[PDB]
Design a protein around this ligand. Sequence first.
Ligand SMILES: CC(=O)N[C@@H](Cc1ccc(CC(=O)O)c(C(=O)O)c1)C(=O)N[C@H]1CCCCN(Cc2ccc(-c3ccccc3)cc2)C1=O
Length: 106
Amino acid sequence: SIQAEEWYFGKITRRESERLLLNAENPRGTFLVRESETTKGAYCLSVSDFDNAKGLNVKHYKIRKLDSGGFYITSRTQFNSLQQLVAYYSKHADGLCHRLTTVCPT
Ligand SMILES: CC(=O)N[C@@H](Cc1ccc(CC(=O)O)c(C(=O)O)c1)C(=O)N[C@H]1CCCCN(Cc2ccc(-c3ccccc3)cc2)C1=O
């Protein structure tokens, strides 16, 4: 169950995710998964990033879950669970701003 995952923050808003992620102590890739504010059954992967152009900033990625079972950000790259998706993106940056590193502090 994802509700049991420590990186699953459930029902928190995009602004709240940004307040949490915009902590100067967070290295690139700090993250959390939350419910989408707009899409029933969809999730959002909120990730911290940092560069010399934007400084500390946050990106939000939509994660889809098909009735058919798969979870994905891009339909070309799917997973059997949200957990496997997180594990994969903790090792490959692919199209994300940074690979996922550690769970966001409260
Ligand atoms: C207003 C906003 O922040 N929208 C987000 C998408 C979004 C996220 C959460 C909610 C919901 C909410 O905030 O509650 C909604 C919404 O529904 O309104 C919309 C966005 O544009 N992120 C960017 C994030 C930075 C990359 C660019 N991109 C397109 C893209 C390109 C490639 C990939 C990719 C990733 C991994 C591997 C391969 C490709 C992913 C996205 C995005 O979607």
